[PDB]
């Protein structure tokens, strides 16, 4: 004698913030599913993040461009945050080329079909000279979790180009996750509960797809776990 949870209304308060509710939860599984989902969501959500950057006139992270105010290292740190949605391919090379006085935000990147820049207002740099012009190529990969600069060296594969600027990859779009189990009194039933999962992300994964993917991964692990071949 059991019930099953069906995905019911999925409200989006902001572009980043979403509330996903699961209404027909039997007593006791509110917390179990809340916690399992929270864990998988925070740990395993596949996302995209900037992996490397090539700017022309800069040999190493510590030097400086003429006519800009942020250091190369700070520009890298700003690029780390760039939230980008690639649909089909895994590795995209975006090219940003802008000149003149003005704040160069992420919107100025040359817009390719498969790439969607979620927040065009994200600042990158501030120019200060009429003739100051910066060109660069940002290579963005797909990945899950967190891989630092120093680990990626294992797969070097002839990293010879000194122009290549490695950035630590934060491959994770989910920023925050909380769940609230509240009694979902349906007019003909005694003790049933609703799970309300409130999730805040950088605006890449849609809530439904996140929850579905988490449930998938948990289901696969439980498949492997249930069978016991002694």
């Amino acid at each position: 004698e059991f019930l099953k949870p069906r995905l019911v209304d999925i409200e989006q308060v902001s572009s980043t913030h979403a509330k996903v509710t699961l209404e027909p939860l039997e007593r006791g599984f509110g917390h179990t599913l809340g916690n399992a989902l929270r864990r998988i969501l925070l740990s395993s959500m596949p996302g995209c993040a900037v992996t490397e950057v090539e700017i022309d006139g800069v040999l190493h992270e510590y030097s400086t461009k003429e006519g800009v105010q942020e250091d190369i290292l700070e520009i890298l740190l700003n690029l780390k945050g760039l939230a980008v949605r690639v649909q089909g391919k895994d590795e995209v090379i975006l090219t940003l080329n802008k000149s003149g006085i003005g704040p160069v935000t992420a919107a100025d990147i040359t817009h390719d079909g498969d790439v969607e820049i979620v927040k065009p207002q994200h600042v990158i740099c501030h120019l200060t000279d009429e003739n100051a012009s910066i060109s660069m190529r940002i290579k963005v990969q797909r990945g899950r979790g967190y891989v630092p600069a120093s680990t990626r060296i294992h797969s070097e594969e002839d990293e010879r180009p000194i122009g290549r600027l490695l950035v630590d990859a934060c491959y994770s779009p989910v920023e925050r996750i909380a769940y609230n189990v509240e009694a979902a009194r349906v007019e003909q039933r005694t003790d049933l509960d609703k799970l309300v999962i409130e999730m805040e992300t950088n605006g890449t994964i849609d809530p439904e797809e996140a929850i579905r993917r988490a449930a998938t991964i948990l289901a696969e692990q439980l498949e492997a776990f249930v069978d016991l071949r002694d």
Partner: protein
């Protein structure tokens, strides 16, 4: 006695790791013992982890 000299400056980026020493302004000290995934850490009712 020295014909010539070459000086080379290396810039190493050192990340926090287990075994570094951390302190407060009031005399409280300690060694970083373990780095846990975000999930394991206690979290507030609101969901922000410590």
């Amino acid at each position: 006695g020295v014909l010539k000299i070459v000086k080379v400056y290396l810039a190493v980026k050192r990340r926090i790791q287990p075994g570094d020493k951390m302190a407060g302004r009031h005399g409280n000290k300690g060694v970083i013992s373990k780095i846990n995934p975000i999930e394991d850490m206690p979290y507030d009712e609101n969901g922000t982890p410590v």
